[PDB]
Amino acid sequence: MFMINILSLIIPILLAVAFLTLVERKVLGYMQLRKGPNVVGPYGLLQPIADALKLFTKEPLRPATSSISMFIIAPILALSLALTMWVPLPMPYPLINMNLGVLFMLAMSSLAVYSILWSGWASNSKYALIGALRAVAQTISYEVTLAIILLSVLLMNGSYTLSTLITTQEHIWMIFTSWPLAMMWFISTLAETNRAPFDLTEGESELVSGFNVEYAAGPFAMFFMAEYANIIMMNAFTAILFLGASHDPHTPELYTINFVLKTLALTITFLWIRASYPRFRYDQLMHLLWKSFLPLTLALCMWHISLPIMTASIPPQS
């Protein structure tokens, strides 16, 4: 009965991911004075299915100079981690109830970068190597600021348990207490998921395709699935962290609907941002994260440590 729950978690996420691509194509089209897919099925509803079937019936190729083991391993790691990172999310109940869900999510995020790194290295191509090194630089840019922002925000929660975030935001959204950090956190997510304006690991206009230039058909589709799943997952995490839906223990579907709508709003905001802005230079991203985000993050961490002691508002559950 637990396997049924695992499947009911993972399959709808993939279905959601497939449809997310259709939505982005349409949203991008209408923001660009066009329509997007509206021919394959009504309103392009069959377009993701056609894309998946085309990708999984095409010939995959092994580069002659590539390292086969790592080349095959990297997409499996990417997709498996993208699927795994959904299990502690309370919606309003988690599939896996952890005492430390935030730290688990951080560790799995840190492990997810190695799919990009090993695909770029094992491709044995110059553009893939450039993309992998850009991924290294991106992680060095965002990691510490992201972690300290998480710590500062969770100082108001009292623990690292995700479900407690529902109780913390019972009467007011946490954003109203931490709207500055939230903005930075949002930007960090954009850097964490390699999304525009920080789409540097792929960098289509500069590196052709970056780390996944040598990948074709099914492994490439798996990389795409993992990236879009990570986008949806991080927006869901942001919605849980900063926009707390009211939970009724006898009517959890209300919480589920609220949470899903907030997550969809955040994802559409991601697509909007992609439609609106140019691309950073990957040294400018590091300078932004280390010379602007880090000092404010440290000062706000100091302030958020001092604040509950000052006002006698320390949360329970040591």
Binding site: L61, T84, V87, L155, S159, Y160, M222, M286
Partner: protein, 115 residues
């Protein structure tokens, strides 16, 4: 036990997808199709040649700044102690030293990439 089952299920699904992608379609592999890609032409050198890092000093500093995260994560539990003054002093002191490290590297041109 449940987390092990979930991890096994996810890895199995990904591996099965890879197996389907590699065994279902028709494969026609020849030397020109599998050659490395450099947009029209044969690469001059190897991709295994050294690739210079212009942000090496920031990369090293990231190692030291990554352990401040370890030191600062138990703060929610540390906030529950009776002697809040000592805990607050130590946390503020640790963050102040981190900020001083950042300032020292910033003023010594340590955040500028090598030319």
């Amino acid at each position: 036990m449940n987390i092990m089952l979930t991890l096994l299920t996810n890895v199995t699904l990904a591996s099965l997808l890879v197996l389907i992608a590699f065994w279902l379609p028709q494969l026609n592999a020849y030397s020109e199709k599998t050659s490395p890609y450099e947009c029209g032409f044969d690469p001059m050198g190897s991709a295994r040649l050294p690739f210079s890092m212009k942000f090496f000093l920031v990369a090293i500093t990231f190692l030291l700044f990554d352990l401040e995260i370890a030191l600062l994560l138990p703060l929610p539990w540390a906030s529950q102690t009776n002697n809040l003054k000592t805990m607050l002093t130590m946390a503020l002191f640790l963050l102040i030293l981190l900020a001083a490290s950042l300032a020292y590297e910033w003023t010594q041109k340590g955040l500028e990439w090598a030319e």
